[PDB]
Amino acid sequence: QFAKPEDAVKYRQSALTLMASHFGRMTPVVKGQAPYDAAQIKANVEVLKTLSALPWAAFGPGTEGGDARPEIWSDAASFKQKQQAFQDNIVKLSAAADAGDLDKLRAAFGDVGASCKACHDAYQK
Amino acid sequence: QFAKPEDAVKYRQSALTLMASHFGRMTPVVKGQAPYDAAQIKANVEVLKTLSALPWAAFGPGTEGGDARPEIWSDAASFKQKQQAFQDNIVKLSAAADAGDLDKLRAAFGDVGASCKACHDAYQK
Ligand code: HEC
Ligand code: HEC
16 A cells, blocks of 8 residues: 555554554553543553554565664564564453453553563564 | 643644555545455455544644644634544445445545545645
8 A cells, every 4th residue: 555665664653653652541540540441441442453453564575664673574474473462462452451350451451561562672673 | 641742743643644544545446446345445444434533532632733723723613523524424435335335435435535625624734
């Protein structure tokens, strides 16, 4: 869907920004600093689920740029493993949200955050 | 969810970028220059539905900036009318996609695009 590699960079940066806001805005809730409304969190995690699937298709062949470390395309199976582990951790977060359980939400949120950090460490300049 | 107004600007720009890619990438399909796969388009419109709901909450009080024309907050009912008409046109596009009908898709796509342009004309610097 991208006329030039810069368009893919633009897209993935935007997706990651949006995905990130939807994750991070829950931090006060998991810490107890903001109230827990199960329906609110269910709805937000549904948004995050959708967003979480979007960046990866914008690291397609020929789309080097931005802050993507070069190690993304040359180790494609390993990068995939990574987004799929993150993507699996998101499934867990959805299950916790859909079940209305703040303890399960806290644990799932932490494992998502660890997966963000793992990919960041390997693949972000 | 925004610590400073700049964060809301950042978010809405990203949402609009993403929403826009999901709309615009269908242009070759509606024109017949790319093949029509009903399932592909259904899935893409589902993404666009989710995205289409996101920008508006990031024009909250105190979030002047970016290319938002000042006329957004002082005429709040009219701006709302506008996003809700766009939002209603998106419902129509979802119905066309879910029904697998390229003629209905073409018509609905055009009315969405007109609604994008209408808000752009009134409210984007
Ligand atoms: C690899 C499988 C990743 C996972 C999982 C997550 N992120 Fe990431 N992120 C990744 C890359 C390779 C990049 C650079 C993209 C580019 O081309 O520049 C990023 C970037 C971000 C950004 C900055 C976006 C921008 O506006 O430029 C943010 C805010 C970000 N990532 C956040 C983030 C969060 C919160 C994640 C888990 C919920 C997450 N990322 C996962 C690679 C990967
Ligand atoms: C008002 C109800 C709008 C509708 C409907 C659409 N857009 Fe728009 N758009 C609007 C504003 C006020 C702005 C400026 C935001 C800011 O603070 O700068 C925009 C901006 C865009 C952009 C640029 C985003 C960026 O990266 O800076 C794009 C690509 C865009 N809008 C596209 C777009 C499309 C394709 C729409 C229909 C599918 C659409 N917008 C609707 C206001 C409104």
